[PDB]
Every structure is written in C-alpha cells, then in structure tokens.
Amino acid sequence: SNAMEVTVPATLNVLNGSDARLPCTFNSAYTVNHKQFSLNWTYQECNNCSEEMFLQFRMKIINLKLERFQDRVEFSGNPSKYDVSVMLRNVQPEDEGIYNCYIMNPPDRHHGHGKIHLQVLMEEPPE
C-alpha cells in the first residue's frame, strides 16, 4: 500500500474559547530524521475554498503565522515520537473548518494524509 497509517479524529468538536489539540500520529518503520522529515498542515474554510498552509516542518517547525489564527497556533507534538499534533489556543467560531496534515518520513515510501473536521460548539448550550 502507498498510504502511511495516520490517526486523526475525522470530526473534532471543541467548545468556543477552549484550547483545542488537533491530534495526529503516524506509523513508520523508520526513525524520524529531522534532516529529511516533512510535514505540512493546512486549513480550508470550505470545500470550495483554498487550502492555506499554517505550519510546516523543514529541518525544524516553521509556524507560518496564518493571520486568521493570530498567534494562537502552536506545535503540540514531537516528530521523533511519531506525533505531529497541533494546538489552537482560545478557539473562536471562525476556526471551524477542514484541517489537513500531510506527512513524509524518508526513506519510507508511504505518504501520509490526515483530515480533521473541526467544529466549534457553544460555551454554554441550553441545558
């Protein structure tokens, strides 16, 4: 198979104003070589909207500071532990959307792609 095993929640429901960890882990037979490992996290508002990069790994983590997230994105994983999760602090309704994580771990031939649909819930729903 060409697809790397990548584990993410297909739907992730978080409370408005909370800190949301977007979990993403992967499997590979090979040690993660920081000189070759690559990661690309993107965000898409809608299916017919562009896909905007917000974090990459090229030798080290690069936070692109995508303006719609202010300074609320942080890396929340450790590539050497096969974990490429991200954290979105202080979630706002506009953070709802599709988050994609693309992974390559040379010399593994398998290519990774996880997709999370993030939904933002009321902080105080009727109860």
Q: Do residues 53 and 40 touch, judged by C-beta distance below 8 A?
A: yes
Solving technique: X-ray
Q: Look at residue 119 and give its three-state secondary structure.
A: strand
Strands of the chain (E only): list them. 6-7, 11-15, 20-22, 25-26, 38-44, 51-58, 61-63, 73-75, 86-88, 97-104, 111-121
What distance lies between CA 67 and its chain's CA centroid? 16
Q: Please list the helix, strand and coil fractions of the chain in percent, rounded to the nearest 5, in that order.
A: 5, 45, 45
